[PDB]
Amino acid sequence: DRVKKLINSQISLLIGKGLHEFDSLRDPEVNDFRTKMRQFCEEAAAHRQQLGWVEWLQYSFPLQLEPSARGNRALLVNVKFEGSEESFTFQVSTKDMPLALMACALRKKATVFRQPLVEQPEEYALQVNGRHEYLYGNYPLCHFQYICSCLHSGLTPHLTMVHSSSILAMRDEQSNPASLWSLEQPFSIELIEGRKVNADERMKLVVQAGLFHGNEMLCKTVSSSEVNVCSEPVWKQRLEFDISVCDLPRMARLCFALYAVVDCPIAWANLMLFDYKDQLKTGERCLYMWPSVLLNPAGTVRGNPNTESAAALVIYLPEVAPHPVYFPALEKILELGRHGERGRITEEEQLQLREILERGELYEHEKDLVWKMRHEVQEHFPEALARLLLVTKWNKHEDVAQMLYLLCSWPELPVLSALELLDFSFPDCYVGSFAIKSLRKLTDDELFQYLLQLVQVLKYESYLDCELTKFLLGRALANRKIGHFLFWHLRSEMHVPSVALRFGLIMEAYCRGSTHHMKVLMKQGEALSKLKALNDFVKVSSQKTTKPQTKEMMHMCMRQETYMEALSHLQSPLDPSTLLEEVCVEQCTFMDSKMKPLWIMYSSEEAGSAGNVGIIFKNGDDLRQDMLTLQMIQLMDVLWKQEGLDLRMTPYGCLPTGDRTGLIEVVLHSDTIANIQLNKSNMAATAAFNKDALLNWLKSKNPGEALDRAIEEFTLSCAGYCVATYVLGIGDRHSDNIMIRESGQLFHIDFGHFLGNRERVPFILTYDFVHVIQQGKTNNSEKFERFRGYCERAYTILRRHGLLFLHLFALMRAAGLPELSCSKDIQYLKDSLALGKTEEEALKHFRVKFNEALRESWKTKVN
Ligand SMILES: COC(=O)c1cc(-c2cc(-c3ncc(CN4CCN(C(C)C)CC4)o3)c3c[nH]nc3c2)cnc1OC
* Residues 132-155: b if buried by 16+ CB within 10 A, e if exposed: bbbbbbebbbbbbbbbbebbeeee
* Residues 157 and 224 grouped into a single domain: no
Q: How many CB atoms lie within 10 A of CB 77?
A: 21
The Cα–Cα gap between 713 and 708 comes to 9
Of 179, 198, 220, the residue that ends a domain is 179
The DSSP result for 223-263, as a single string, is E---EE--SS-EEEEEEEEEEEGGG--TT-EEEEEEEEE--
Atom of ligand 1 nearest to the CA of 589: 21
The Cα–Cα gap between 744 and 711 comes to 6
Contact 347, 302 (CB under 8 A): no
* Residues 619 and 584 grouped into a single domain: yes
Contact 189, 317 (CB under 8 A): yes
Contact 67, 537 (CB under 8 A): no
The Cα–Cα gap between 390 and 842 comes to 29
- Range list of β-strands (E), 273-311: 283-288, 290-291
Sign of the dihedral defined by the CA atoms of residues 611, 614, 617, 622, in that order: negative
The Cα–Cα gap between 730 and 748 comes to 10
Q: Nearest 5°: phi and psi at 177? A: -60, 160
Q: After which residues does the chain become discontinuous at a C–N distance over 2.5 Å? A: 71, 178, 262, 293, 359, 757
236: left (phi over 0), alpha (psi -120 to 50) or beta: left
Residue 285, strand partner residues: 315
Domain residues for the domain of 93 are 50-179
* Residues 491 and 610 grouped into a single domain: no
Which residues lie with the beta carbon below 6 Å from any ligand 1 atom?
589, 591, 593, 597, 599, 616, 618, 623, 626, 652, 664-667, 670-672, 749-750
* Residues 453 and 366 grouped into a single domain: yes
Nearest CA to ligand 1 atom 30: 666
The Cα–Cα gap between 501 and 10 comes to 18
C-alpha distances (whole Å) from 382 to each of 210, 417, 435 are: 33, 10, 13
Q: What is the Å distance from ligand 1's center to 92 Cα?
A: 38
Q: Nearest 5°: phi and psi at 162? A: -110, 125
Q: How many CB atoms lie within 10 A of CB 794?
A: 25
Residue 418, strand partner residues: none
Q: How many CB atoms lie within 10 A of CB 464?
A: 21
Nearest CA to ligand 1 atom 2: 593
Atom of ligand 1 nearest to the CA of 587: 21
Out of 592, 734, 750, give the residue to mutate to test ligand 1, the one with the largest number of ligand atoms within 8 Å of its CB.
750
* Residues 448 and 527 grouped into a single domain: no
Q: Nearest 5°: phi and psi at 275? A: -80, -175
Q: Report the Cα 38 to chain-centroid distance in Å.
A: 25
Q: What type of residue is 805?
A: F
Q: What is the Å distance from ligand 1's center to 678 Cα?
A: 17
Burial of 275 (0-12, 13-18, 19+ CB in 10 A): middle
Q: How many CB atoms lie within 10 A of CB 37?
A: 22
Q: Say which residues have a Cβ less than 8 Å from residue 862's Cβ, sequence separation at least 6.
A: none
The Cα–Cα gap between 422 and 433 comes to 9
Please write down the HEC assignment for all residues of 69-123. Answer: CCCCCEEEEEEEECCCCCEEEEEEECCCCHHHHHHHHHHHHHHHCCCCCCCCHHH
Q: Report the Cα 208 to chain-centroid distance in Å.
A: 35
Q: Say if strands 598-603 and 613-619 run parallel, antiparallel, or are unpaired.
A: antiparallel
The Cα–Cα gap between 374 and 368 comes to 10
Alpha-helical runs (H) found in 339-479: 347-358, 364-372, 374-380, 385-391, 397-407, 415-421, 429-439, 444-457, 467-478
Nearest CA to ligand 1 atom 9: 749
Q: How many CB atoms lie within 10 A of CB 35?
A: 11
Residue 288, strand partner residues: 312
* Residues 496 and 530 grouped into a single domain: no
Atom of ligand 1 nearest to the CA of 665: 29
Out of 551, 596, 749, give the residue to mutate to test ligand 1, the one with the largest number of ligand atoms within 8 Å of its CB.
749
Q: In the structure, how many helices (H) and strands (E) does the chain have?
A: 31, 27
Q: Nearest 5°: phi and psi at 751? A: -85, 70
The Cα–Cα gap between 318 and 245 comes to 11
Contact 148, 73 (CB under 8 A): no
Helix axes 467-478, 444-457, angle to 10 degrees: 140
Q: Look at residues 437, 438, 471, 441 and name the one whose alpha carbon lies nearest to residue 454.
A: 471
Name the DSSP class of 219.
S
Of 286, 308, 328, the residue that ends a domain is 328
Of 482, 514, 546, the residue that ends a domain is 514
The DSSP result for 623-650, as a single string, is -HHHHHHHHHHHHHHHHHHHTT------
* Residues 141 and 243 grouped into a single domain: no
C-alpha distances (whole Å) from 512 to each of 44, 271, 515, 717 are: 10, 30, 6, 44
Terminus-to-terminus CA distance in the chain, angstroms? 78
Domain count, the chain: 5
The Cα–Cα gap between 188 and 318 comes to 8
Q: Report the Cα 270 to chain-centroid distance in Å.
A: 26
Q: Nearest 5°: phi and psi at 258? A: -95, 130
* Residues 508-537: b if buried by 16+ CB within 10 A, e if exposed: bbbbbbbbebbebbbebbbbbebbbebbeb
Q: What type of residue is 611?
A: G
Q: Report the Cα 671 to chain-centroid distance in Å.
A: 28
**For 740, what's the count of Cα atoms within 13 Å in the CB-facing half-sphere?**
27
Q: Look at residues 33, 4, 10 and name the one whose alpha carbon lies nearest to residue 501.
A: 33
Q: What is the Å distance from ligand 1's center to 730 Cα?
A: 18
Out of 542, 590, 591, 660, give the residue to mutate to test ligand 1, the one with the largest number of ligand atoms within 8 Å of its CB.
591
Sign of the dihedral defined by the CA atoms of residues 693, 697, 703, 708, in that order: negative
* Residues 314 and 378 grouped into a single domain: no
Contact 686, 748 (CB under 8 A): no
Q: How many CB atoms lie within 10 A of CB 490?
A: 22
Q: What is the Å distance from ligand 1's center to 619 Cα?
A: 14
Residue 193, strand partner residues: 234, 314
Q: Look at residues 765, 766, 772, 670 and name the one whose alpha carbon lies nearest to residue 711.
A: 772
Atom of ligand 1 nearest to the CA of 593: 1
**For 301, what's the count of Cα atoms within 13 Å in the CB-facing half-sphere?**
22
Nearest CA to ligand 1 atom 15: 671
Q: Nearest 5°: phi and psi at 347? A: -65, -25
Helix axes 802-812, 624-642, angle to 10 degrees: 160
Q: Nearest 5°: phi and psi at 389? A: -65, -35
* Residues 333 and 322 grouped into a single domain: no
* Residues 487 and 381 grouped into a single domain: yes
Q: Look at residues 645, 647, 651 and name the one whose alpha carbon lies nearest to residue 633.
A: 651
Q: What is the Å distance from ligand 1's center to 735 Cα?
A: 13
Q: What is the Å distance from ligand 1's center to 738 Cα?
A: 10
Burial of 1 (0-12, 13-18, 19+ CB in 10 A): exposed
Nearest CA to ligand 1 atom 6: 750
Out of 623, 664, 676, give the residue to mutate to test ligand 1, the one with the largest number of ligand atoms within 8 Å of its CB.
664
Sign of the dihedral defined by the CA atoms of residues 271, 273, 277, 279, in that order: positive
Q: What is the Å distance from ligand 1's center to 670 Cα?
A: 9
What experimental approach yielded this model? X-ray
Q: Nearest 5°: phi and psi at 638? A: -60, -45
**For 475, what's the count of Cα atoms within 13 Å in the CB-facing half-sphere?**
25
The Cα–Cα gap between 830 and 726 comes to 12
Name the DSSP class of 328.
P
Residue 80, strand partner residues: 87, 160
Name the DSSP class of 127.
E
The Cα–Cα gap between 465 and 676 comes to 54
Q: Say which residues have a Cβ less than 8 Å from residue 667's Cβ, sequence separation at least 6.
A: 650, 652, 739, 741, 747
Q: Report the Cα 465 to chain-centroid distance in Å.
A: 21
Q: Report the Cα 708 to chain-centroid distance in Å.
A: 37
> How many residues would you count in the chain?
863
C-alpha distances (whole Å) from 187 to each of 222, 274, 531 are: 12, 13, 55
Nearest CA to ligand 1 atom 24: 671
Q: Look at residues 45, 37, 30 and name the one whose alpha carbon lies nearest to residue 470.
A: 37
* Residues 722 and 832 grouped into a single domain: yes
Q: Say if strands 87-93 and 582-583 run parallel, antiparallel, or are unpaired.
A: unpaired
Over its C-alpha atoms, the chain yields an Rg (Å, rounded) of 30
* Residues 490 and 563 grouped into a single domain: no
The Cα–Cα gap between 78 and 83 comes to 15
The Cα–Cα gap between 830 and 825 comes to 9
Out of 589, 602, 616, give the residue to mutate to test ligand 1, the one with the largest number of ligand atoms within 8 Å of its CB.
616
The Cα–Cα gap between 531 and 526 comes to 9
Atom of ligand 1 nearest to the CA of 626: 36
Given in angstroms, what resolution was this structure solved at?
A: 2.0
Q: Say which residues have a Cβ less than 8 Å from residue 107's Cβ, sequence separation at least 6.
A: none
Residue 600, strand partner residues: 615
Burial of 33 (0-12, 13-18, 19+ CB in 10 A): buried
Atom of ligand 1 nearest to the CA of 752: 36
